Specification:
- It is classed as immune system.
- The entry lists the keywords C5B9, immune system.
- The entry is titled "open conformation of the membrane attack complex".
- Chain A: Complement C5,Complement C5.
- The structure is cut from a larger assembly and holds chains A (45 residues) and B (63 residues).
- With 45 residues, chain A is mainly alpha-helical.
- Chain A has two helices and no strands.
- Chain B is mostly beta strands and 63 residues long.
- Chain B has a two-stranded antiparallel ribbon.
- Chain B is elongated and about 80 Å long.
- Chain B starts with 19 loop residues before the first strand and ends in a 27-residue tail after the last strand.
- The chains are: A mainly alpha (45), B mainly beta (63).
- At the A-B interface, helix 2 of A face loops of B.
Chain lengths: 45, 63
């Protein structure tokens, strides 16, 4: 099924914005992995 | 037309941790600081859903 594949507003809200630097930088890896898997980059200009 | 608390401050930028604060000034009884959570973990946006009250666990050829 092609129900849904949704991910947005993460790059604009939290991309670059003491111990929570890991918490900040970790989801970027998974966002890049999802973007590489879905092969969808034409959404942005 | 006949101490009291003052106006609250603007919500500070959402820190790397959940901790986001707002401060009121007694310029009296009450609180001077309010620390709430913020992460914006919900990135997906589809639409406002409608929810039920309570659910249950369990209600061609068969299995």
């Amino acid at each position: 099924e092609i129900l849904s594949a949704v991910l947005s507003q993460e790059g604009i809200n939290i991309l670059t914005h003491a111990e929570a630097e890991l918490m900040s930088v970790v989801p970027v890896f998974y966002v890049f992995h999802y973007l590489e898997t879905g092969n969808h980059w034409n959404i942005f200009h | 037309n006949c101490g009291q608390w003052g106006c609250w401050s603007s919500w500070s930028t959402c820190d790397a941790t959940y901790k986001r604060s707002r401060t009121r000034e007694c310029n009296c009884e009450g609180e001077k600081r309010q620390e709430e959570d913020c992460t914006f973990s919900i990135m997906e946006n589809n639409g406002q859903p409608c929810i039920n009250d309570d659910e249950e666990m369990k209600e061609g050829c068969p299995q």
